[PDB]
């Protein structure tokens, strides 16, 4: 019942992000250091320092769009995928998902077929057609089929509507996705597939209500590239990292 536990880990993790310390430790863009080595006091001091550099908070808003740099964040796609990837895969050696090796000319089916049946993997996807970054979680399930789940956030603006990571995880975080559809989505040929096929693959895999009327294929960059990278993880280490972060610490 790894699936049931996974669901609970993800749920308590997401609920804790209303907490200042949890939020800042989760959503930070330093990737060369261990996620769990992040100090929420120091992060807060770094923001204070930056705001001072800018001549105070009301000035800081003027020159950077109006954002209160102390506010808690809900992350854009690259930031959610990069950090949840580190959360899942790290133990005591830092991993920088921005620097790992990506595969550009491999089909997803080809790649998954090479993965150890007894290992958990997470795949980070950098999708140029969509302009989107997201994760595919492939936990090993005992006497069960190879099963895939999506983890993502999206501020919107492309083919897909906006979705917060918290909402995504709450509605679809334990919803298995077709490796078949994923293989089709992730192929080179995806750019040439009919409107209705593209719209339905997208809605089915990436839209929170699986609603094809919520998908705008006119925003696709049909010449965009697809790259992806996979990495094993220890399930208990994942739980352990998330518990720590949720510990409002």
Residue numbers in the entry: 14 to 262
Question: What do the authors of the reporting publication say about this deposited model?
Answer:
One family of T3S effectors, the Cifs, re-program the host cell cycle causing arrest at the G2/M or the G1/S transition. In this study the crystal structures of Cif from P. luminescences (CifPl) and B. pseudomallei (CifBp) are presented. The structures reveal a head-and-tail domain arrangement, with the head-domain adopting an overall fold similar to papain-like cysteine proteases. The structure of the tail-domain of CifPl and CifBp presents an extensive surface area adjacent to the active site suggestive of a binding surface for interaction with a specific substrate.
Limited protelysis of CifBp with trypsin identified a stable fragment with a molecular weight of ∼30 kDa, as determined from SDS-PAGE gels (not shown). MALDI-TOF analysis of this CifBp fragment is most consistent with digestion of the protein following Arg55 (PINNACLE Lab., Newcastle University). Therefore, CifBp may in fact start at Met61 and amino acid numbering in this study reflects this (i.e. the sequence numbering begins at M(1)ITPIISSNLG). Although it is expected that Cif proteins function as monomers in vivo, each of the Cifs produced in this study displays the properties of monomer-dimer equilibria in solution, with the exception of CifBp which purifies as a single species (whose apparent molecular weight suggests a dimeric form). The two chains of CifBp overlay with an rmsd of 0.42 Å (245 equivalent Cα atoms) and can therefore be considered essentially identical. The structure of CifBp determined here is virtually identical to that recently determined independently. The tail-domain of CifBp (back to residue 14) adopts a conformation very similar to that found in CifPl, even though there is very little sequence identity between these proteins in this region. The structure of CifPl overlays on CifBp with rmsds of 1.24 Å (chain A, 226 equivalent Cα atoms) and 1.25 Å (chain B, 226 equivalent Cα atoms). CifPl and CifBp overlay on the structure of CifEc (chain A) with an rmsd of 1.33 Å and 1.20 Å respectively (145 and 151 equivalent Cα atoms). The structures presented here show that the conformation of the occluding loop is conserved in both CifPl (residues 203–212) and CifBp (residues 168–177).
